Design a protein around this ligand. Structure first.
Ligand code: GTA
Ligand code: MG
Ligand code: MG
Lengths: 726, 725, 485
RNA sequence: AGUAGUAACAAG
RNA sequence: GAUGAGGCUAUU
RNA sequence: AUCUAUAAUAGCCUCUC
């Protein structure tokens, strides 16, 4: 019979025109299970393997094993190499400077000003951050507050000044304190029969030595990344502490300032702006091709990008860039690469050893990895531990002087890649190379007279990148005649083609609330129509599919439907009771009246006229209990803007003391906001205590109320007495 | 409730922990503890929502009288828990169906922007939908219309003044301009019981502007960006007429763009005046005829004046330079690109204007007469007016003149490109740069003795009249009739040409308002790629007839209206040489009986312009024919191109990314025909690539070859061949 | 400095450029052709082409899942009353007695007058749901001392060869049927002409997709995953019978409720997103498992009765299987309808292109043709080694089936294979366009491709299809090597 | 068992 | 147990 | 001529085997 071959579509359609069919994004993304210690150990082993020919020594500050591949022997083969040459990096930076006069100076000046006007609270904008006091992961704000309190314990009050510079000076000084006192979390275990173990955390003072604190401040907490497409094997990510994040900001700002003025940089531009810049660059390269010659595009990615880049090279880069800056700013910018040169990797949760016959399992933590004979580990884990032994610390961590653990200097790496792209020629050979860089991804455009000369130029670029510690991926890189290529997963074929598959995961219900999710879905459909080349029929089908998914997620099927459910009975009663049925929202069993032309109108506004007065009043009740109120202020949003009480109640854990601290902070902040109404809208400023500001504000309010007749004699006297007591 | 707050503060201070937090936490550090959270926020909220909606009571209730109104159960369904009260979505539905009826004034007030959006959509007209190529450019455009627009800092200051005047801080002078507005807002929100943050974000919606990089095609006004998803795609266009009112500036810009396009299309035609009139009479700016728009608006550019003369209107020799209104009096200028050294040391390509010009300059209330020469501001006579307006006009005049001092007066950072690499008008960038730092410009300009005449007095940099004044500026106490000729040149009664087609700028810009042409040949007003695709589609449609005429006829097939439109995107310098080359190639293909359909289709459009052969009588030889706009807009003679490519295996022609089939309109024997007979004029393939001749010859080497001599040619990589004249 | 360092750098450090030729492109994953390896077995969550749905005419009232199953079983009382099993096939580690007892318990619970779909935690139900199989967690010190506690050696997915059932599934799932399963809700009325064009195009597109078997399978998957997630959240510590149900509509407008089988949900205490709940599925089928036994190593099959569809009766078997799923899989199955979009947006785009070339909407011309344009056809497959053409709707159905299989058989192997084969596809496209592609390490790219081909049936079939299409492309290009030469 | 895949769940 | 950067989106 | 300016939270997409 006739057998269907989907690939035969490509016979009638070019691959780029049908690239969306090559992305299996309707399937479940891969997830990681159990421990990530194996991946972390693999990363450490590979990072040390790519630099094992460098200078090995013992750190005098922490006692760790340090490997320095910079200025090391040049590679003799095509394996990944971290032996970047300082002279070549400086030459590339000088070339970049002389192509762009004043770029380094302007970037340094801008970064200095931004740092000078930057506050400590900027460190609260991150995600899960390593907390050294508890040696765990906590929200960035929580970790920052804990660090500030611990510093206050150790006579370090720079954070009170408000600026980031005093706080970073405090971190530097804390690195020198012979002993560190802080608050940590200790668990009390109780036997609850079922027997189960109930954990009650509480705050207790704790003390560590200078060396332990230094190692903790340099530690990186490693975990496993989840929901990553296009990869067969899982990988490990890492997060740094407050000390490192305090200094990474300025280096990233400087690198961004540099990159934004480079025409070969794919960062920070993104989306439509990035597409426009890339198209302009490609057109310029096409027009610049010598007459009668050949232009070739190399689509390339860099292998072991993070493992091979060295923080010492980044320190040299920072020193070169901030040549004409004040000494203090140069030291500030140098701090972060110095910290990364002495980084320590935490190896994770450890491993699990099991008895199959006895049906038992146990988690060996990282400190106790070598407590059991290596024969009890499996083959790969045994080999990895054997190779890890030289770089292992008795406290369960590893020394990782070489490499960048995970994407902390994307902008600086992009600057280095663009500097590599800026050479454009070796030995006056008859070729010219340019291109585009975005972290480890690059597109190299080589113009020459024949294919052989273009290949020679590509080889020269490869060797030059090797000199800078950049290893082009010979397995995943390819080249062709200019006109077709791929960059950052964007496919150019005489123009950038639309990739609708990548947007599919965003077409579901967002998961905020009914009204917010409706708005988000409609706006997603609209933006995919605008940007990702989605047609009107596909857009209408997307509207229908979103409505179906929304009704099934929120159990708000049509009022006239016969679907069953607790909400559905009330939906049916509302449908029966309503005359202007078209004005009912989809969340209330009403019909969907969305089409292409009104994807940008909020649902309530769209149906406002059609609502019956009683239903409209009930839905848009100013005092409805489902939306949080201020305290009784009126809330204009409808009843469908509710919030789910996200109680992260970990099983067998009772936070009878940490929730107490959360509630104390919440009450203090709520009272402050009551005294200062603009605090939520605008960040309050002041180096004085909250108590003093609140007391002065209340005193002024009482005095002005008394003068205006708002407050009588007795109440004014009571207020004055209370304030004086405070 | 000050006393209640004091009592609450005292009760909180009773707690030791709260006391230490309040005493040790600074006002700056509040922003830290405001975010203090004990547990990481759950990830994957879509899965979390799908999971929680299957629970019993996933929603939190606000304790109060309203919450207690909700019954514990309703017809066998438990709406609320019997710590923190929680409810089910059934509770929300019950409230919506039987809950108390409240007032809806707050919602109507807060979301007035969305109601205006809905009204704009509703009071809108929809035109026809057309199917065809659409070239879209990614530009930074405003998303939603705003009656008043200010930068986020100014908007935040205004919002703080309106809603939180007490804790507003320094009265920044930048708020002065908006003071009146603030009062108005404080009038509307005097007795509003809505939470201040919601009102603040309403004000931000009404004031703060959201600008994003989006792909647009001929309509960039915020009223059109709202409907952008419906306006057009990559292969269709939808005519849309938004409701409400449109600004005069948008209409002026749109009519300038329309006139420029009309002139560009018309110049290449025979009798350009008649075609220009015909197109202008059928042009509509959004929903207004172009003629009415020209008559109403008092302004425009050279193209607008030319179109006015063609339509029988009166020319308005007016010009806008951002915040200047310049009316020509006498003199004619010519724009030439030149590399100018800026005071910062960076060289920039700028269009310098030569000649001597006299202008009536207006700015706000300040008026004056400007006498300008090439790269020098000769004189500027001004009358007493507001000081701020006077100095702003002075600096605008100085930057307009492109004087050497002004270029040398730059000391700082100036961005002539955006983050996307797109070019920004250097003149406007310099104007903006010098508007806010006029002190350096005045210092670099110089000073001289103030005039001592009866009515002439100078002004110093100190904002006041004084014995010292900057060079050129002197304070004082004190329509044309033309006929348009065939070539769209305006001449006075004396015959001197004041304007011409060559004076129209070549810049391609996106009209703020949608422009329509109520003619079947509207596609001839499109961009380069659209014109190329339409021309080649037309050639393919009539391919058999064109082939028949070519095989029988000689030159009549080279003249068509489609090729006339195609000629507008070929630069006039190379049009004749391209035509000669293409005609020679086609003639050699026909006469020698070695015909390739793909090359015939590729080269036929270029044979329209009158041929221009070399001084020796032979046509020019080319490797690629360049078209207007972008570096990717070219047609390769030998190999494929981004605009034109051919696949002989599948016999598929790719034009501007669109695939068409030549099956049937092709002879299989053409696959056995060589490409070398259809790439150079007067050259025919002689045999295999002979190494004795040596390396492949270039175009210049080919042109100097004598007749009858061979040469090695590389059609494309891996395919050499030898040709003879 | 750079020049000196490059001068003293060894020549062995090279990018080793190599011009790519058609001959250099060898078939990917040769091991899928050797017969030493077993053919990849069927491992999808539910039956797709072998599904048999018991149809009960409905009056448009969605009464209840348990009630729907009760009515369907009452209509087919002979199958419901079948108490003695006749074993046809048995899984290696399955207990056919326990599986049949669990099936009978499910039937009795569904057919009982009680309104609860709960099953008692009996010995056979406990075995089927894997009750009490988690290892006991002991302290670190005891485990360290205990020398018998060792790290478990990881289990790697095995290597399998091409199986014909994947091709059969692809052929069958892309065919048109007489039943419509999509329940797309309404939208607002059209006002703008673009909206009218979209509605007119949606007519054709949805008519084509809705009538294909893949649409019914997708709807069954979506509904079952929704019900399973709801039951898992609601009933964490209960065994629940979850009927596999769908709702179809005939061409005459009459609606039917289709019962494809019964599912037993084990204890659902899924704290993590990757926590596993066991589901025991008993699905009706007409396929005899003995026709090809290599497809059903994981299924215990009983012959439960017969049905009449024509003059000839067809046997009805019960495929029983122990399976598992997590919250992520359930959530992603609840939103499998997005497959539609991925198929539409592609084909839609093509139509739009034609419109731009013709100056008018070309949906009708592409699907069926008109006076000026003949119907658009795509290379759809092979018949005895010869390329075969098919209609626009056939290609749309094929792409929709491809997306549905991406969902059904999607895992890390498919992701890696898709990425690496996409790189190879770009190289092949460069070859087709005469852009003279060059490579540095082609064997490395091939090894990257083949590292992901272990046991995913879709990945193995994709490798086979890629090899066939690459051979066809080589044959086509052989004619392109003699142009102007 | 099964899911699944370099490590986990199959309740705590 | 779920990180860094960039872009876009919704809300306060 | 949008170059400037831009508080916080959350989501989606892109970027060691
Ligand atoms: O947005 C573009 C254009 O549409 C807009 N513009 C120009 N004129 C108007 C009016 N009248 N109303 C609304 N918008 C208007 O400004 C942008 C100009 O784009 P572009 O076409 O590139 O400008 P041009 O090529 O004309 O050169 P530019 O230096 O930008 O001048 C623009 C404007 O200023 C006049 N002008 C300046 N100078 C120094 C002039 C000069 O020395 N001699 C003459 N004859 N004109 C001078 C231009 O002529 C234009 O009027
Ligand atoms: Mg990469
Ligand atoms: Mg790449």
């Amino acid at each position: 019979g006739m057998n269907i071959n989907p690939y035969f579509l490509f016979i009638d359609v070019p691959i780029q025109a049908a690239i969306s069919t090559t992305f299996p994004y309707t399937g479940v993304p891969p997830y990681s299970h159990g421990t990530g210690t194996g991946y972390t150990i693999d990363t450490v082993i590979r990072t040390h393997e790519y630099s094992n020919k460098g200078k090995q020594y013992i750190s005098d500050v922490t006692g760790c094993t340090m490997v320095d591949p910079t200025n090391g022997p040049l590679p003799e083969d095509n394996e990944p190499s971290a032996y970047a040459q300082l002279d070549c990096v400086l030459e590339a930076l000088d070339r970049m400077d002389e192509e762009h006069p004043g770029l380094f100076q302007a970037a340094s000046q801008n970064a200095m000003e931004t740092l000078m006007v930057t506050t400590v609270d900027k460190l609260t904008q991150g995600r899960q951050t390593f907390d050294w006091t508890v040696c765990r992961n906590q929200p960035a704000a929580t970790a920052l507050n804990t660090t500030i309190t611990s510093f206050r314990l150790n006579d370090l009050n720079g954070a009170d000044k408000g600026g980031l510079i005093p706080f970073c000076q405090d971190i530097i000084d804390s690195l020198d304190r012979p002993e560190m006192t802080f608050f940590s979390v200790k668990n009390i275990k109780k036997k609850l029969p079922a027997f189960l173990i109930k954990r009650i955390p509480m705050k207790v003072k704790d003390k560590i030595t200078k060396v332990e604190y230094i190692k903790r401040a340099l530690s990186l907490n490693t975990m496993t990344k989840d929901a990553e497409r296009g990869k067969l094997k899982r990988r490990a990510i890492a997060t740094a502490g407050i000390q490192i994040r305090g200094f990474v900001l300025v280096v990233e700002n400087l690198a961004k300032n540099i990159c934004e003025n480079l025409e070969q940089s794919g960062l920070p531009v993104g989306g439509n702006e990035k597409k426009a810049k890339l198209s302009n660059a490609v057109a310029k390269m096409l027009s610049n091709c010598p007459p009668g010659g050949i232009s070739m595009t190399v689509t390339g990615d860099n292998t072991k990008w993070n493992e091979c880049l060295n923080p010492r090279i980044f320190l040299a880069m920072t020193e070169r860039i901030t040549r004409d800056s004040p000494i203090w700013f140069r030291d500030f910018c140098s701090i972060a690469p110095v910290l990364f040169s002495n980084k320590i990797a935490r190896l994770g949760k450890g491993f699990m050893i099991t008895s199959k016959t006895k049906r038992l399992k146990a988690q060996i933590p990282c400190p106790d990895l070598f407590s059991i004979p290596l024969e009890r580990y499996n083959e790969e884990t045994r080999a990895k531990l054997k190779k890890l032994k030289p770089f292992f610390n008795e406290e369960g961590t590893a020394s990782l002087s070489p490499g960048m653990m995970m994407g902390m200097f994307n902008m600086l790496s992009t600057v280095l890649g663009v500097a590599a792209l800026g050479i454009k020629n070796i030995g006056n050979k008859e070729y010219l190379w340019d291109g585009l860089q975005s972290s480890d991804d690059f597109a190299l455009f080589v113009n020459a007279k024949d294919e052989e000369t273009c290949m020679e130029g590509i080889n020269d670029f490869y060797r030059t990148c090797k000199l800078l510690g950049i290893n082009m991926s010979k397995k995943k890189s390819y080249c062709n005649e200019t006109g077709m290529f791929e960059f950052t997963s964007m496919f150019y074929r005489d123009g950038f083609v639309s990739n609708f598959a990548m947007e599919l995961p965003s077409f579901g219900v967002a998961g905020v609330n009914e009204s917010a999710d409706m708005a988000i879905g409609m706006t997603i459909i609209k933006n995919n129509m605008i940007n990702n080349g989605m047609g009107p029929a596909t857009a209408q089908t997307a509207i229908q599919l979103f409505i179906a998914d929304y009704r099934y997620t929120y159990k708000c099927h049509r009022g006239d439907s016969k679907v069953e459910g607790k909400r559905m009975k009330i939906i049916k009663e509302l449908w029966e009771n309503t005359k202007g049925r078209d004005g009912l929202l989809v969340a209330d069993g009403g019909p969907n009246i969305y089409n292409l032309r009104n994807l940008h109108i909020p649902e309530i506004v769209l149906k406002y006229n059609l609502m019956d007065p009683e239903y409209k009043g009930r839905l848009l009740h100013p005092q409805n209990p489902f939306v949080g109120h201020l305290s009784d202020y009126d809330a204009v949003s409808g009843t469908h803007s509710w919030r789910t009480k996200r109680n992260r109640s970990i099983l067998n854990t009772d936070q009878r003391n940490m929730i107490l601290e959360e509630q104390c902070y919440a009450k203090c902040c709520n009272l402050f906001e009551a005294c200062f109404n603009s605090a939520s809208y605008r960040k309050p400023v002041g180096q004085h205590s909250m108590l003093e500001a609140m007391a002065h504000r209340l005193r002024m309010d009482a005095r002005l109320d008394y003068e205006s007749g708002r407050m009588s004699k007795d109440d004014f006297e009571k207020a004055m007495a209370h304030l004086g007591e405070i | 409730m000050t006393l209640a707050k004091i009592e609450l503060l005292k009760q909180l201070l009773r707690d030791n922990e709260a006391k230490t937090v309040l005493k040790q936490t600074t006002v700056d550090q509040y922003n830290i503890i405001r975010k203090f959270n004990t547990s990481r926020i759950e990830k994957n909220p879509s899965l979390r929502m799908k999971w929680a909606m299957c629970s019993n009571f996933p929603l939190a209730l606000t304790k109060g009288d309203m919450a207690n109104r909700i019954p514990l159960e309703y017809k066998g369904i438990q709406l609320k828990t019997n710590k923190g009260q929680m409810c089910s979505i059934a509770a929300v539905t019950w409230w919506n169906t039987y809950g108390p009826i409240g007032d809806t004034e707050g919602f109507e007030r807060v979301y007035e922007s969305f109601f205006l959006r809905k009204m704009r959509l509703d009071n809108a007209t929809w035109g026809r939908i057309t199917f065809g190529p659409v070239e879209r450019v990614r530009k930074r455009v405003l998303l939603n219309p705003l009656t008043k627009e200010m930068p986020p800092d100014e908007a935040s200051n205004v919002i703080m003044e309106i809603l939180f005047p007490k804790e507003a801080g320094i009265p920044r002078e930048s708020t002065w301009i908006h003071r009146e507005l603030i009062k108005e807002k404080r009038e509307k929100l005097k007795g509003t019981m809505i939470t201040p943050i919601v009102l603040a974000y309403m004000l931000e919606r009404e004031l703060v502007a959201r600008r994003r990089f989006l792909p647009v095609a001929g309509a960039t006004s915020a009223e059109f960006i709202e409907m952008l998803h419906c306006l057009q795609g990559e292969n269709w266009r939808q005519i849309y007429h938004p409701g409400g009112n449109k600004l005069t500036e948008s209409r002026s810009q749109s009519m300038i763009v329309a006139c420029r396009k009309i002139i560009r299309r018309s110049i290449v035609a025979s009798n350009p005046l008649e075609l220009a009139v015909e197109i202008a009479n059928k042009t509509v700016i959004d929903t207004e005829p172009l003629k009415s728009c020209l008559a109403a608006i008092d302004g425009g550019d050279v193209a607008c004046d030319i179109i006015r003369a063609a339509l029988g209107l009166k020319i308005r020799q007016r010009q806008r330079f951002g915040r200047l209104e310049l009316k020509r009096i006498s003199g004619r200028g010519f724009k030439n690109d030149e590399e100018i050294l800026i005071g910062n040391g960076t060289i920039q390509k700028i269009g310098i204007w030569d000649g001597e010009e006299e202008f009536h300059v207006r700015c706000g209330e300040c008026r004056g007469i400007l006498k300008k020469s090439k790269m020098k501001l000769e004189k500027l006579l001004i009358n007493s007016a507001k000081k701020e307006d006077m100095r702003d006009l002075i600096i605008l005049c100085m930057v307009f003149s492109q004087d050497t001092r002004m270029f040398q007066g730059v000391r700082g950072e100036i961005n002539f490109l955006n983050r996307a690499g797109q070019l920004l008008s250097p003149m406007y960038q310099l104007q903006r740069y010098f508007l806010n730092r006029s002190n350096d410009l005045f210092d670099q300009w110089g000073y001289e003795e103030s005039p001592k005449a009866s009515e002439l007095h100078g002004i110093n940099e100190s904002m006041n009249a004084s014995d010292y004044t900057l060079k050129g500026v002197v304070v004082t106490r004190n329509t044309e009739k033309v006929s348009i000729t065939k070539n769209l040149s305006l001449i006075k009664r004396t015959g001197e040409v004041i304007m011409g087609a060559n004076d129209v700028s070549e810049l391609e810009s996106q009209a703020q308002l949608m422009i329509t042409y109520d003619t079947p040949k509207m596609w001839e007003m499109g961009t380069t790629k659209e014109l190329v695709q339409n021309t080649y589609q037309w050639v393919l449609k009539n391919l058999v007839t064109l082939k028949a005429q070519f095989l029988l006829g000689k030159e009549d097939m080279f003249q068509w209206d489609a090729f006339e439109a195609f000629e507008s995107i070929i630069p006039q310098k190379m049009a004749g040489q391209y035509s000669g080359f293409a005609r020679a190639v086609l003639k050699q293909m026909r006469d020698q009986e070695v015909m390739k359909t793909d090359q015939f289709i590729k080269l036929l459009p270029f044979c329209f312009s009158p041929p221009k052969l070399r001084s020796n009588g032979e046509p020019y030889q080319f490797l690629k024919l360049v078209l207007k706009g972008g570096g990717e807009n070219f047609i390769e003679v030998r190999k494929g191109s981004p605009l034109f490519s051919y696949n002989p295996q599948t016999e598929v022609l790719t034009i501007c990314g669109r695939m068409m089939s030549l099956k049937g309109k092709i002879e299989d024997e053409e696959r056995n025909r060589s490409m070398g007979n259809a790439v150079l004029a007067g050259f025919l393939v002689s045999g295999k690539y002979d190494p004795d001749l040596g390396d492949f010859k270039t175009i210049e080497e080919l042109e100097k070859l004598k007749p009858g001599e061979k040469a090695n040619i590389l059609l494309y990589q891996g395919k050499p061949v030898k040709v003879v004249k | 400095a750079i020049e000196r360092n490059l001068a003293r750098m060894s020549p062995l450090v090279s990018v080793t450029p190599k011009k790519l030729t058609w001959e250099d492109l060898r078939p990917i994953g040769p091991h899928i052709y050797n017969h030493e390896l077993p053919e990849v077995p069927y491992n999808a969550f539910l039956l797709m082409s072998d599904e048999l749905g018991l149809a009960n005419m409905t009056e448009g009232k969605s009464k209840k899942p348990k009630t729907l199953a009760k009515e369907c079983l009452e209509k087919y009382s002979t199958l419901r009353d079948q108490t003695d099993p006749i074993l046809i096939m048995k899984s290696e580690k399955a207990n056919e007695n326990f599986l049949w007892k669990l099936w009978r318990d499910c039937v009795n619970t569904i057919s009982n007058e009680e309104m609860s779909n709960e099953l008692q935690k009996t010995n056979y139900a406990k075995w089927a749901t894997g009750d009490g199989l988690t290892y006991q967690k002991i302290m670190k010190e005891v485990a360290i001392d205990d020398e018998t506690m060792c790290q478990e050696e990881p289990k790697i997915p095995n290597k399998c060869r091409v199986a014909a059932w994947v091709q059969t599934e692809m052929n069958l799932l892309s065919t048109l049927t007489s039943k419509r399963a999509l329940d797309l809700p309404e939208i607002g009325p059209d006002v703008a002409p673009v909206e009218h064009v979209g509605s007119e195009r949606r007519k054709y597109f949805v008519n084509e997709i809705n009538y294909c078997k893949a649409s019914t399978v997708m709807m069954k998957y979506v509904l079952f995953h929704t019900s399973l997630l709801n039951e898992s959240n609601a009933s964490m510590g209960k065994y629940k019978v979850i009927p596999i149900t769908n709702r179809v509509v005939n061409e005459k407008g009459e609606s039917f409720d289709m019962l494809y089988g019964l599912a037993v949900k084990g204890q659902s205490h899924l704290r993590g997103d990757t926590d596993v709940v066991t589901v025991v599925t008993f699905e009706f089928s007409s396929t005899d498992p003995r026709v090809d036994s290599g497809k059903w190593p994981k299924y215990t099959v009983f012959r439960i009765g017969s049905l009449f569809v024509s003059g000839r009766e067809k046997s009805v078997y019960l495929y029983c299987r122990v399976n598992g799923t997590n919250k992520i899989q359930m959530k992603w199955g609840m939103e499998a309808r997005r497959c539609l979009l991925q198929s539409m947006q592609q084909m839609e785009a093509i139509v739009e292109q034609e419109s731009s070339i013709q100056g008018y909407d070309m949906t009708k011309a592409c699907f069926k043709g008109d006076r000026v344009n003949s119907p658009k056809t795509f290379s759809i497959g092979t018949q005895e080694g010869k390329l075969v053409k098919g209609s626009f709707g056939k290609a749309l159905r094929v792409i929709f089936t491809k997306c549905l299989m991406h969902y059904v058989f999607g895992n890390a192997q498919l992701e890696g294979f898709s990425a690496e084969s996409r790189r190879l596809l770009l190289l092949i496209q460069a070859l087709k366009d005469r852009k003279g592609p060059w490579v540095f390490d082609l064997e490395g790219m091939y090894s990257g491709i083949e590292e992901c081909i272990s046991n995913n049936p879709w990945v193995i079939q994709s490798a086979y299809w890629f090899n066939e299409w690459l051979g066809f492309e080589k044959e086509g290009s052989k004619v392109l090597e003699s142009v102007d030469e």
